[PDB]
Amino acid sequence: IPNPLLGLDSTENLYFQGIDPFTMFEEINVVRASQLHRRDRFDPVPELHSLMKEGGLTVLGTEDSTEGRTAWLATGIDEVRQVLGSDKFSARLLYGGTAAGITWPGFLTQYDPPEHTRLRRMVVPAFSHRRMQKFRPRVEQIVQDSLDTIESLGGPVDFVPHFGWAIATPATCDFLGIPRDDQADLARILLASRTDRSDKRRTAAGNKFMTYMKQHVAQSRRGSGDDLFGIVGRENGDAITDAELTGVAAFVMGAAADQVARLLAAGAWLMVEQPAQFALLREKPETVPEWLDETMRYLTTDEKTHPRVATQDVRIGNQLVKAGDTVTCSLLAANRPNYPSAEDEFDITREKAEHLAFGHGIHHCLGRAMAELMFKVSIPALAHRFPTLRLADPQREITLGPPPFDVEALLLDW
Numbered sequence: 001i002p003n004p005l006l007g008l009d010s011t012e013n014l015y016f017q018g019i020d021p022f023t024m025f026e027e028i029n030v031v032r033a034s035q036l037h038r039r040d041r042f043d044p045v046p047e048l049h050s051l052m053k054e055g056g057l058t059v060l061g062t063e064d065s066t067e068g069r070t071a072w073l074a075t076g077i078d079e080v081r082q083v084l085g086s087d088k089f090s091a092r093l094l095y096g097g098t099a100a101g102i103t104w105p106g107f108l109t110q111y112d113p114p115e116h117t118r119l120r121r122m123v124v125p126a127f128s129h130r131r132m133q134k135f136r137p138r139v140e141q142i143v144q145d146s147l148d149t150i151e152s153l154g155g156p157v158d159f160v161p162h163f164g165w166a167i168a169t170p171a172t173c174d175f176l177g178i179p180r181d182d183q184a185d186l187a188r189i190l191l192a193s194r195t196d197r198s199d200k201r202r203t204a205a206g207n208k209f210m211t212y213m214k215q216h217v218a219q220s221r222r223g224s225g226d227d228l229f230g231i232v233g234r235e236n237g238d239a240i241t242d243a244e245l246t247g248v249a250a251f252v253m254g255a256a257a258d259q260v261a262r263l264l265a266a267g268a269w270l271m272v273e274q275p276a277q278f279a280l281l282r283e284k285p286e287t288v289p290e291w292l293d294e295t296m297r298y299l300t301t302d303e304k305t306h307p308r309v310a311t312q313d314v315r316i317g318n319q320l321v322k323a324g325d326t327v328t329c330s331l332l333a334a335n336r337p338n339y340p341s342a343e344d345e346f347d348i349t350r351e352k353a354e355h356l357a358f359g360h361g362i363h364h365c366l367g368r369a370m371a372e373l374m375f376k377v378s379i380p381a382l383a384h385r386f387p388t389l390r391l392a393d394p395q396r397e398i399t400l401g402p403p404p405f406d407v408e409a410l411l412l413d414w
C-alpha cells in the first residue's frame with residue numbers, strides 16, 4: 001500500500017482495490033532500472049553516476065514482506081561479469097516457476113540450460129563469422145544504396161529513417177531470405193506492433209507479422225536458400241520446431257533490427273560530435289585498429305541486461321544475493337567506470353578495448369558478429385561519403401526516448 005499523502009511519484013503511488021502487489025513490485029523496479037539508464041547526451045545520468053559510487057552492487061528495490069525479494073543492480077565490472085557468468089542465476093525463472101513451459105519459443109533470452117544450450121547451438125551456424133563474411137557484400141550494397149538515397153535527397157536528412165532503419169530493415173530481412181517485394185510492408189507492420197497506442201491494434205499487427213513469418217518458415221525450412229531458415233532447417237530437420245524458428249526469425253526482424261537501427265543512429269550522431277576523430281578513421285584506418293571496440297564501449301547502446309533470478313543464496317562481491325532475488329546488470333556502468341574523466345572520454349586511438357556492450361556468459365549477444373559487420377561497414381562508408389557531415393541545427397539538442405539508447409531524430413547536413 002503506497003501512501004499518497006507523503007509522496008508525489010505517480011508510478012509509485014498507483015493503487016486500486018484488487019491490485020496485485022507482486023506485479024507492482026516487479027513493475028516499479030523495471031521503471032527504476034529504466035530511469036537509471038536514460039542518457040545525458042552520450043553519458044550516464046547523474047543518478048547512475050551517484051549509484052556507481054556506492055559500490056558494485058546496490059539495492060534497486062525491496063518487497064514489503066518480511067523475508068521478501070530484493071532487486072539488485074550490478075554496476076561494477078567484477079560484479080557484472082560474476083553475475084552474468086554464474087550458473088546460480090536463471091533467466092527462465094523470471095517468466096514463471098519450474099513447472100512453467102516456454103512462453104515465447106525461440107526467445108533465447110528466456111531459456112535456461114540444457115534447453116538454452118541445445119537451441120542456441122542449433123541456430124549458431126547461421127550467425128557465425130564465416131557466415132558474416134559471406135553476407136558482407138550484400139551489406140556493402142545496402143549501405144551504398146542508403147548513402148545514394150541520402151545524397152540524392154539533399155540535406156538536411158533525418159538519419160534515423162534514412163540511415164539506421166534504411167540499413168537495418170533490408171539487412172535483417174535479407175538475412176532471413178525475405179523477398180524484396182515484402183520488406184516495406186513488413187517494416188510498416190512491425191512499426192505498428194512496436195508503436196501503436198492502441199494495445200488491441202498493436203496485438204493485431206503482431207499477429208499479422210507472426211502469421212506471415214510462420215508461413216515463411218514453413219516455406220523456407222526445407223528449401224535450398226542461404227537464409228537462416230534453410231541453414232538451420234537443413235542442418236537440424238525436425239529437431240527444431242516451426243515455433244522455435246519463427247521466434248528466432250521474429251526476434252531478428254523485430255527487437256534486433258530496432259537495436260541495430262538505434263546503434264547506427266547513435267554512431268552517426270557521435271561522428272558529427274567527434275569529426276576530427278572520425279577523420280582519422282576515414283583517412284588513416286590502419287592507425288586506429290580498435291576504433292570499433294572503443295565506439296561500442298563509449299556508446300553502450302544496450303545499457304542493461306534482462307534481470308537474472310538467483311536460484312540459491314550466492315555471494316556477489318561483498319553482498320549476499322538471496323535465493324529468489326533478482327540482479328540487473330548495468331552494461332553502461334561497466335563500460336563507463338571512470339565517468340567523468342579524461343580517460344572515459346571517447347578516444348578512437350585507445351588500445352585494449354574493454355568492454356561488455358554485448359553482454360557476458362551463456363546469453364551473450366548471438367548477433368554480435370552481425371551487429372559489428374553492420375557498424376564496421378556503415379560508419380566508415382558514411383565518413384568517406386560525407387566528410388563534412390554535421391548537425392543541421394547545432395543549437396538543437398538531440399531528443400532521446402526511453403532506453404535503450406533511443407535517438408528519436410537526427411537531422412544532418414553536409
Ligand code: HEM
Binds near residue numbers: 120
Ligand atoms: C541484428 C543484430 C543482432 C542480433 C541478430 C542479436 C541477437 C541476439 C540474441 C538472439 C540474443 C539472446 C542470446 C541468448 O539469450 O542466448 C542477444 C543478446 C544480447 N544482445 Fe544482441 N543482437 C543483435 C544486435 C545487438 C546490438 C546492436 C547490441 C548492443 C550493442 C546487442 C546487445 C546484446 C546484449 C547486451 C545481450 C545479452 C542480454 C542479456 O544478457 O540479458 N545486440 N542478441
